[PDB]
Subunit: 381 residues, 2 copies
Amino acid sequence: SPIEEQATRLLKEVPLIDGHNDFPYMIRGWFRNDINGQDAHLYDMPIGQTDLQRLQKGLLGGQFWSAFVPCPKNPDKEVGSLEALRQTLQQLDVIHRLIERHPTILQFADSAASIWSSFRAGRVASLIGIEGLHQIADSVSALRMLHRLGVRYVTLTHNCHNAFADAATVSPELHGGLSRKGERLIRELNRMGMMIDLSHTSHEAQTQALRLSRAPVIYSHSSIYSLRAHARNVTDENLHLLHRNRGVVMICFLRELLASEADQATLAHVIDHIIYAGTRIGYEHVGIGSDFDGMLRGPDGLHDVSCYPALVAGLLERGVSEEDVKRVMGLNVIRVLEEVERVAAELQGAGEECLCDELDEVWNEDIKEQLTRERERVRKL
Amino acid sequence: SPIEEQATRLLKEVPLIDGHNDFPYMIRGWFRNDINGQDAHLYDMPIGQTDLQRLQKGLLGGQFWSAFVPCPKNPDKEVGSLEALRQTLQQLDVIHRLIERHPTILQFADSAASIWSSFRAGRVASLIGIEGLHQIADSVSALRMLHRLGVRYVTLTHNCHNAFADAATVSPELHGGLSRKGERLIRELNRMGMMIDLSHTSHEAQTQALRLSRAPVIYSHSSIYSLRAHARNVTDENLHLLHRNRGVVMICFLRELLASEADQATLAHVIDHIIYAGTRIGYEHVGIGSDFDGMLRGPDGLHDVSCYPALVAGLLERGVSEEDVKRVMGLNVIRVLEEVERVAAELQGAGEECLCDELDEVWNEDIKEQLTRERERVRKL
Ligand SMILES: [Cl-]
Ligand SMILES: [Cl-]
Ligand SMILES: [Co+2]
Ligand SMILES: [Co+2]
Ligand SMILES: [Co+2]
Ligand SMILES: [Co+2]
């Protein structure tokens, strides 16, 4: 088919960069992060919507691999929070090991330049994002170390309220948007060059984050509210504030977010959602955020990661121009990551002060007096 | 003085690389890891044995900055262990921020090549080590992420027994050396290219680690047992096994480890300890491991980080050859780090399997059956 040829050509010209895939958590469920001698299974998985053979088949250019861990449910609240931090390092560890053991398919990327160089080599550009600020255990230091480990976006919440922001699916509201800590964290995320992700966050938390952020943000996996009313979807108000923010809404393949009846959801609905956003806020602010392996079943026509060429062909069939399809595929999310890193470079270049942790006093006054007396003794010499 | 001129020349030819300095924990005690607008104090500290002015004055070429956190003392044992992991990320964060905010003085290094390039630029080569396996919270995944954050050695214990090995100063013995986990961790540390540090570990744990390790190890800050009998010092038996291992004993400035009467300890004693080891196991297996800022007061003549030229001159005055002084200064610890990285490269190159964490089952059989049924439905299409 000529349109299938056109879609294949576009997929080779520019990388289709998917906003969210939970294949690392599927590895934790199935293999329990032990992938030694599991290559036959990693290429041909007995479960899920992602494996390395189907990943090649769909001609995907890049991927933000989710380092999701569940919201803490332990009665001991400090233990649950600290457990999430240890589990986060396990998920970052298995993502890095997945990339390093399969260098011909996957190549790690943390920037616009690293995405392109990965794509030129014929590799899937493998980026990392964490799904919720519960994962950092209330530690801004830990968050900066997650950035150093290769994390390039942070979803502000998952399906639980935290110290910083409100989740969409939890009632009642705790903060009614962002907290005072949350507002201060927006500045720190902009300063360090961490891309803000507004999926899973409440409508009010989106509105506040979109006005406050000095860098463009993303929705790593969210759909349109006007087409399908859901707490997880993006309202017209927040779509306009995303336009001002210069951000990108990466459209989700979750069936509950595309249609009221789940079994009726399709590839055509995903394209309706992409076209709606592209029509109203322009095609430079729309992306693709599948949430593959964050669901049991996908829409009809988008059952797994091999189905991306059908989406590219489907967009072209509707009359979306090649240039606008390339934008939706990956150029938009590359631009946001590029602008996030430029905003960080200019804020760091202007000597903006970093957000410190709230640390307890480890020494009493007796320890400090011994230390100051000792220093002055050395000054006398 | 001609010998002072000779010492100054040697300090400019090769980097004096100190094995252990606890200045990052002093920043946590004094500033509480908030160094914003504290440059006047960071250059001229009101306490302690390390600041950025005195660091320049002593002509130090490199430094393994300690990311030490205390052994957990909480009644809730899981919380204490998980707390140590969060505190470790705070200490790694402040070390990286200390280096990044002072690029003219400090430059981060994680290899032999990066140490040299830092030294050629006129910077103190800033490496990182953690003081105890309590810091990883029983997670080998976390340990691999600490390596990715820039940690290049791990002290197996501090002053507490852990799951892997026995500390020197705690009785009774738990494992009587290394545990079965510890033995398995030695292989993993060799595979990843993490330098093993045997300071603070029991005599039996040293003996076992020295026989088992495929890469050379270090004592980041330990002294000689025959000159001064202490649990923390290295016995003749372990000095010989260190020679076979090809490791380096980095001599400590702790007064309790140099003499029975603490106030009688001196620079001359440190040189006696260096010469003892250099005479018996050769000068290619001896180093300098001050433990500055891990003590209130230092020996007479080694009161702070500005006193390194006195040590270099003192070694030359005793009749230690220029070539052997250069070895003790830094060439030996560079060689160990170089060999540790080569052993890792050859073990990784031979496809040796990594040590995985013990992970719990997150899915029941009902979840797994839904996933396998769902996959087979997609295969039918
Ligand atoms: Cl380009
Ligand atoms: Cl050289
Ligand atoms: Co997810
Ligand atoms: Co999600
Ligand atoms: Co220490
Ligand atoms: Co110590």
